[PDB]
Amino acid sequence: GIEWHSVRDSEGQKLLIGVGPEGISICKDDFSPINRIAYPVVQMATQSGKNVYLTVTKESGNSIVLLFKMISTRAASGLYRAITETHAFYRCDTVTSA
């Protein structure tokens, strides 16, 4: 079901990002879980060439940025689209009586 994307963190550690129904899943290359990020916590998503940045809200109230380095601009666009468009499936909104 979930589409896993190959990324590298700030240090260079190989990770796997899984975009699912509840949110973002961060794992190691052997799929061992590390952390999970729910979509309401995700404030923003940014793409700068091969890189993808995420603005995450903390339970404290403040916002911090997560960096994900990728092999190509098409790989980054694939992860950016996954976070942005599976949000147009998570966060739905329309009129009823038109």
Numbering used by the authors: 186 to 283
Provide text from the study:
The second pathway involves the sterol-regulated inducible degrader of the LDLR (IDOL, also known as MYLIP), which is an E3 ubiquitin ligase that promotes the ubiquitylation and subsequent lysosomal degradation of the LDLR.
Moreover, there are clear differences in the F3c′ region, where the FERM344 crystal structure has an α helix (α7), following the F3ab, which spans residues 279–300 and folds back onto the F3ab. Because the expression construct used to crystallize F3ab has an incomplete F3c′, helix α7 is unfolded and helix α6 is shorter in all of the three F3ab monomer structures. The unraveled peptide binds in the F3ab peptide-binding site, making an interaction that closely resembles the β-β association observed in many FERM-substrate peptide complexes.
